[PDB]
Design a protein around this ligand. Structure first.
Ligand SMILES: O=C1O[C@H]([C@@H](O)CO)C(O)=C1O
Ligand SMILES: O=C1O[C@H]([C@@H](O)CO)C(O)=C1O
Length: 163
């Protein structure tokens, strides 16, 4: 009867209906969920940390047991700092599965308390990824069906400006 705390790390660049499904599913099984948004210094997220957090808070803030935090560094250092029970990840495809298996084993070797649990997407989100959504929006496609409305607007406002 100890409290459970799971971290869902990601770039969330941007958040999609698939991530929303995962976090909702997880919020029913664990006491606390942390949506952990990897800053990506030596990477190049299209959306800033502030935009990514706001887009996440706008789709998931209605769930009382969900928190939103930016992080960088080693996922296992964040894991220790957060006092987490586990990391959560979604597995969409075979390449996801192989990479995630390797990472779980590497993290367990860096921290023996480390744990990773996985969810499988509902089939209505199995074909949605952040990368593909970026590609369609860039080419002026409609992403309304795959992402929350606030993300649709954020793509319009990214066009409107230039950064
Ligand atoms: O959170 C993430 O979003 C995508 C993927 O989860 C979407 O399928 C990605 O590269 C992450 O780290
Ligand atoms: O925040 C929102 O949730 C749905 C979206 O998840 C379905 O694409 C929608 O359109 C919003 O206004």
């Amino acid at each position: 009867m100890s409290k459970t705390r799971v971290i869902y790390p990601g770039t969330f660049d941007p958040i999609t209906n698939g991530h929303v499904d995962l976090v909702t599913r997880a919020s029913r099984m664990f006491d606390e969920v942390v949506v952990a948004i990897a800053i990506g210094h030596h990477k190049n997220p299209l959306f800033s940390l502030e935009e990514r957090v706001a887009l996440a808070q706008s789709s998931l803030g209605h769930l009382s047991n969900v928190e939103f935090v930016g992080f960088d560094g080693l996922l296992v250092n964040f894991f220790k700092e957060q006092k987490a029970t586990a990391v959560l990840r979604g597995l969409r495809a075979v390449s996801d599965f192989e990479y995630e298996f390797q990472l779980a084993n590497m993290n367990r070797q860096l921290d023996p308390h480390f744990e990773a649990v996985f969810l499988t997407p509902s089939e209505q989100y199995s074909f949605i990824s952040s990368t593909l959504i970026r590609e369609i929006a860039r080419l002026k496609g409609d992403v309304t069906k795959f992402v929350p409305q606030a993300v649709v607007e954020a793509f319009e406002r990214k066009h409107q400006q230039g950064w």
